[PDB]
Amino acid sequence: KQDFLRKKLKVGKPKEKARNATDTSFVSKTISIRNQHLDQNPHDLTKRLTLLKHHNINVRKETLTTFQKSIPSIIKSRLMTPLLTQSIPLICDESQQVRQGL
Amino acid sequence: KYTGEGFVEKFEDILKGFPNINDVHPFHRDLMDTLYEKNHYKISLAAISRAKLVEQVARDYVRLLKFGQSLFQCKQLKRAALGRMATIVKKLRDPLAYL
Amino acid sequence: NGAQGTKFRISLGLPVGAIMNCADNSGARNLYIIAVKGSGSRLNRLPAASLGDMVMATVKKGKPELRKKVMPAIVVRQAKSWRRRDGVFLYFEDNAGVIANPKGEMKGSAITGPVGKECADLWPRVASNSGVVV
Amino acid sequence: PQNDYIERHIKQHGKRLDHEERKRKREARESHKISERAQKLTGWKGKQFAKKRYAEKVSMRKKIKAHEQSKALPTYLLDRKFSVPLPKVRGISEEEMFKVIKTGKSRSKSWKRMITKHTFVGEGFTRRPVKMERIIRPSALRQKKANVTHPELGVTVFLPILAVKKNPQSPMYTQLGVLTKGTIIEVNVSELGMVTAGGKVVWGKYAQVTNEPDRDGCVNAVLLV
Amino acid sequence: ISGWKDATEFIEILARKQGRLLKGGEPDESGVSKQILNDFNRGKIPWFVLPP
Amino acid sequence: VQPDRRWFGNTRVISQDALQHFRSALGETQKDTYQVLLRRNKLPMSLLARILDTESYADAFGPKAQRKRPRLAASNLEDLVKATNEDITKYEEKQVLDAENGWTSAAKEAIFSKGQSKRIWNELYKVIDSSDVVIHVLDARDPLGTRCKSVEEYMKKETPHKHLIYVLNKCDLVPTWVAAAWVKHLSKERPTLAFHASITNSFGKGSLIQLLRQFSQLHTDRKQISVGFIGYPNTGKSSIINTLRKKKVCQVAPIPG
RNA sequence: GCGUUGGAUUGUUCACCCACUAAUAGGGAACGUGAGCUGGUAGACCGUCGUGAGACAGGUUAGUUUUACCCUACUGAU
RNA sequence: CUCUUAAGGUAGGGAUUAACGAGAUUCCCACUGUCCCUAUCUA
Ligand SMILES: Nc1nc2c(ncn2[C@@H]2O[C@H](COP(=O)(O)OP(=O)(O)OP(=O)(O)O)[C@@H](O)[C@H]2O)c(=O)[nH]1
Numbered sequence: 001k002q003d004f005l006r007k008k009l010k011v012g013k014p015k016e017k018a019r020n021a022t023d024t025s026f027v028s029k030t031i032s033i034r035n036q037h038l039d040q041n042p043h044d045l046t047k048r049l050t051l052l053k054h055h056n057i058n059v060r061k062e063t064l065t066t067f068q069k070s071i072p073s074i075i076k077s078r079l080m081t082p083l084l085t086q087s088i089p090l091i092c093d094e095s096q097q098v099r100q101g102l
Numbered sequence: 103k104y105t106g107e108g109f110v111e112k113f114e115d116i117l118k119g120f121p122n123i124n125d126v127h128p129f130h131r132d133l134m135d136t137l138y139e140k141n142h143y144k145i146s147l148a149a150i151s152r153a154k155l156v157e158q159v160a161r162d163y164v165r166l167l168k169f170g171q172s173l174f175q176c177k178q179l180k181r182a183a184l185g186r187m188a189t190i191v192k193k194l195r196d197p198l199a200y201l
Numbered sequence: 202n203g204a205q206g207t208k209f210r211i212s213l214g215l216p217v218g219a220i221m222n223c224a225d226n227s228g229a230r231n232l233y234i235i236a237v238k239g240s241g242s243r244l245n246r247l248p249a250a251s252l253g254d255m256v257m258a259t260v261k262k263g264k265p266e267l268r269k270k271v272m273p274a275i276v277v278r279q280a281k282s283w284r285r286r287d288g289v290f291l292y293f294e295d296n297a298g299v300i301a302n303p304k305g306e307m308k309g310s311a312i313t314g315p316v317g318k319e320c321a322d323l324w325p326r327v328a329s330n331s332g333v334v335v
Numbered sequence: 336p337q338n339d340y341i342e343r344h345i346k347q348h349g350k351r352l353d354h355e356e357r358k359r360k361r362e363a364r365e366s367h368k369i370s371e372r373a374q375k376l377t378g379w380k381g382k383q384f385a386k387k388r389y390a391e392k393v394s395m396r397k398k399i400k401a402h403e404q405s406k407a408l409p410t411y412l413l414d415r416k417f418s419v420p421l422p423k424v425r426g427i428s429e430e431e432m433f434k435v436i437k438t439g440k441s442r443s444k445s446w447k448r449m450i451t452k453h454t455f456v457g458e459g460f461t462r463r464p465v466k467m468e469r470i471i472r473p474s475a476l477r478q479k480k481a482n483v484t485h486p487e488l489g490v491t492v493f494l495p496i497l498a499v500k501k502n503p504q505s506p507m508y509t510q511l512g513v514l515t516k517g518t519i520i521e522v523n524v525s526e527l528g529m530v531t532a533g534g535k536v537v538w539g540k541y542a543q544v545t546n547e548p549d550r551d552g553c554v555n556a557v558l559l560v
Numbered sequence: 561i562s563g564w565k566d567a568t569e570f571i572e573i574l575a576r577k578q579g580r581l582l583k584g585g586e587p588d589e590s591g592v593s594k595q596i597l598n599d600f601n602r603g604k605i606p607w608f609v610l611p612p
Numbered sequence: 613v614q615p616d617r618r619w620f621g622n623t624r625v626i627s628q629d630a631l632q633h634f635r636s637a638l639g640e641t642q643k644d645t646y647q648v649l650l651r652r653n654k655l656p657m658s659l660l661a662r663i664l665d666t667e668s669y670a671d672a673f674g675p676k677a678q679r680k681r682p683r684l685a686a687s688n689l690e691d692l693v694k695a696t697n698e699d700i701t702k703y704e705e706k707q708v709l710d711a712e713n714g715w716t717s718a719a720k721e722a723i724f725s726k727g728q729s730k731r732i733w734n735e736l737y738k739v740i741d742s743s744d745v746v747i748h749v750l751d752a753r754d755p756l757g758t759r760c761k762s763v764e765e766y767m768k769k770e771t772p773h774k775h776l777i778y779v780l781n782k783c784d785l786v787p788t789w790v791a792a793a794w795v796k797h798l799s800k801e802r803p804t805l806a807f808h809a810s811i812t813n814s815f816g817k818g819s820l821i822q823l824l825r826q827f828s829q830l831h832t833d834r835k836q837i838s839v840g841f842i843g844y845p846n847t848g849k850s851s852i853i854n855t856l857r858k859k860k861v862c863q864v865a866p867i868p869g
Numbered sequence: 870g871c872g873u874u875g876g877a878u879u880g881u882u883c884a885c886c887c888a889c890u891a892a893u894a895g896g897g898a899a900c901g902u903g904a905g906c907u908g909g910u911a912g913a914c915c916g917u918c919g920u921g922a923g924a925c926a927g928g929u930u931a932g933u934u935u936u937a938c939c940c941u942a943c944u945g946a947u
Numbered sequence: 948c949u950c951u952u953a954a955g956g957u958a959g960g961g962a963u964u965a966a967c968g969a970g971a972u973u974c975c976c977a978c979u980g981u982c983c984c985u986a987u988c989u990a
């Protein structure tokens with residue numbers, strides 16, 4: 001229970017830093033927030049695409065209705081084959097409403 | 103608390119009663135400047151304002167007194183607050199004579 | 202001060218927390234608040250006075266420009282049973298209120314309805330602004 | 336008003352008829368009345384009277400002294416163990432340091448201990464949760480800066496404390512950071528511009544506290560050069 | 561409601577509508593204003609400040 | 613306390629080049645609020661005329677008064693005329709700019725001082741001192757009204773090791789573009805999530821969860837991390853907590869207190 | 870010697886606010902363990918903890934001592 | 948060290964939300980001896 005001490009000389013190991021050498025090294029991580037998608041973008045239906053897997057049922061129904069209404073402006077685009085890929089498996093869905101919307 | 107309140111009442115009577123040498127009229131301003139040396143005037147009144155410090159001492163030492171566990175401790179804290187007030191006022195010997 | 206004459210005694214009708222009428226067209230309808238000038242100091246007793254007594258008051262009903270604003274003025278009617286030192290007991294239909302500055306000078310310029318004899322004798326500008334005494 | 340009007344009035348009319356005689360007689364009776372106030376004025380007023388009279392005596396003694404008087408090493412070695420200035424300080428009981436605190440509606444659990452004296456917690460303190468904290472170091476009894484004096488230079492400075500290395504009472508108290516008398520602390524000294532041989536700036540030094548800051552809000556200390 | 565002027569008139573319109581009036585015919589302006597001020601904060605009345 | 617040659621010695625040393633580089637990097641780092649230092653305890657943060665000598669209050673004014681002429685003297689005598697006219701014009705201007713008879717205004721009701729109290733602010737400072745993170749809840753109707761800048765200044769000066777983020781709440785009451793505008797305006801300084809509090813229909817829950825577990829990953833040594841909720845009354849602190857837990861944990865009411 | 874107020878405020882008051890006033894001075898006889906009258910265990914809920922029974926860093930709510938006719942003192946009466 | 952976070956508000960109509968209760972609480976009208984400030988009467 002001393003106020004000053006040494007480990008030992010410890011032959012073989014790196015020597016040491018003496019007693020008072022200041023260590024000016026650090027690391028600074030940067031925080032990352034979500035975007036939250038509060039501002040309308042042209043790529044907005046690509047985000048509603050995945051709501052066809054939503055655990056809720058009215059969500060899926062209203063999403064299918066939105067995609068129904070947005071057909072003529074997207075019929076020739078990079079979104080239609082993923083739309084059908086992600087919506088075809090709703091044939092085995094639990095709801096007459098969603099099957100009818102499809 | 104009473105000792106603090108007395109000092110700040112006194113100092114407030116000085117600060118509010120005395121005029122603001124700026125903010126009055128240019129004629130009176132220049133007259134009182136050539137009479138009393140505006141710089142000295144403002145400096146003295148600023149000294150009194152900054153001394154009105156006493157509030158800090160009173161608040162700090164009261165908040166310390168909340169944890170007093172003995173008559174001797176509480177007495178010494180009281181004495182300390184009043185002594186620091188006295189030091190502040192002792193450093194106000196010349197401005198009050200001027201004022 | 203402001204009044205002309207002595208502190209004379211007529212019975213008390215108007216304690217603190219009493220809404221009384223204003224009938225002049227300065228804008229107010231009502232007068233409430235705390236204070237009575239020349240009131241004593243006794244434990245548990247209410248400040249209540251008349252004798253053309255000056256009191257602090259606010260407009261409970263009236264124009265917003267003078268609502269929210271404390272003001273002095275003078276009792277002119279009481280509706281309690283007062284005694285004249287010349288004979289009979291007097292009393293009015295109602296209480297009445299009305300407005301002034303600390304010197305006794307009125308914000309309004311004319312009074313409706315009767316005003317008390319002793320109130321007018323004590324306050325000159327009330328007697329000038331009143332067309333009807335008693 | 337308007338100027339020194341009473342000075343003008345004294346020049347024009349003049350002070351009274353019975354002014355100089357009365358002033359002379361007041362100055363004469365003052366000798367009697369001084370002693371009268373001494374044998375009277377019971378209490379604080381007599382105490383203050385005696386204080387004033389003693390100070391006045393000393394002033395006149397010094398004045399007369401000044402009147403009547405106005406009527407081997409070299410320069411560089413003039414002005415000149417490793418023991419600290421305070422070994423063997425008063426010992427503090429654990430009872431006098433820790434206050435008991437009781438918890439519950441029916442207060443029956445105590446298990447909590449409030450440190451009564453001034454403390455140094457650190458820079459990133461961040462209190463523990465209440466169900467998990469046992470040691471309580473209240474915010475008012477938490478010091479960041481001390482009043483450190485260099486014995487040389489006759490100078491003091493309000494320096495920020497960096498650490499507590501040795502409180503002589505029960506080195507638990509060092510880890511708690513209790514600033515009792517005789518406690519040894521690391522303080523920053525960058526304001527003084529000290530530099531070692533090599534050009535490395537010194538920014539930390541040992542100091543020993545000289546006061547009992549539980550009685551005074553001040554933490555006064557002496558540098559160990 | 562509709563088409564008011566004069567918030568003093570607004571209150572009396574709303575009181576005559578809600579049947580919120582005193583013994584007589586004086587519409588209770590005080591309680592109606594209290595309810596309006598509760599609605600304003602609680603979000604029954606939509607309102608918002610614009611930023612720069 | 614025994615003698616030792618290890619007292620009286622320099623205990624903490626640093627070279628000038630390392631010192632200056634360390635100053636520069638941290639001046640870069642700690643101006644950015646999205647950045648955060650990891651340890652913060654092993655690091656040195658501590659490394660980051662007068663006329664009375666001439667005139668003695670007594671030669672200026674008094675019976676002694678060794679002061680006959682000024683030093684506040686303009687030459688070219690017309691110059692002080694140019695000054696006096698300018699000063700009179702400025703004076704008359706201030707008069708009409710800032711532009712009594714024996715009536716007063718009624719007392720302020722004692723209910724308007726309810727947020728202000730020793731009892732409440734003791735709880736505030738207790739919560740902060742116990743917290744590792746401080747969320748500042750704002751109403752999207754009036755965030756700058758509901759901001760409380762003095763607490764942020766206190767947290768800057770006193771406690772830089774705390775994190776101090778913003779949460780816009782009641783975003784369901786205003787349009788989406790107002791919320792986006794405010795979030796853009798405030799993300800410049802502080803992260804500033806948007807939120808809507810409800811046990812059933814919520815918004816921002818997962819984002820806030822992600823941010824809190826980020827701070828947890830940073831404070832890996834503390835064994836737990838405390839998050840205080842600061843703000844005006846009736847902003848939704850209790851409702852945000854009830855939203856995170858997804859049941860009624862804290863009492864809630866539309867009345868403030 | 871004689872007086873030293875009326876009120877607002879329980880998201881609380883070891884206090885402050887505005888008025889009236891001649892003034893709105895401080896204290897004791899209880900609080901140097903514990904003593905008029907009035908606000909501030911058993912049931913139940915939320916929170917923290919606990920494997921649990923339960924406990925508490927908490928918080929909210931409801932919730933039965935009942936003299937004098939005895940001696941003395943005091944007040945009046947034979 | 949890296950990047951995904953699908954407790955994503957489906958929409959900017961997303962929360963303006965019964966009746967009942969010797970349940971806990973605040974305010975208003977009316978009303979009064981609760982109060983100023985006590986007085987009187989009956990068994
Ligand atoms: N529309 C909407 N209302 C909210 C939201 N959050 C809270 N509220 C409402 O705001 C009312 C008062 O806010 P509180 O939840 O009490 O927030 P608080 O005042 O910080 O809570 P306390 O700490 O208990 O005082 C609640 O009764 C809620 O009904 C929100 O996100 N959207």
Ligand SMILES: [Mg+2]
Pocket residue numbers: 845846847867868869
């Ligand atoms: Mg609230």
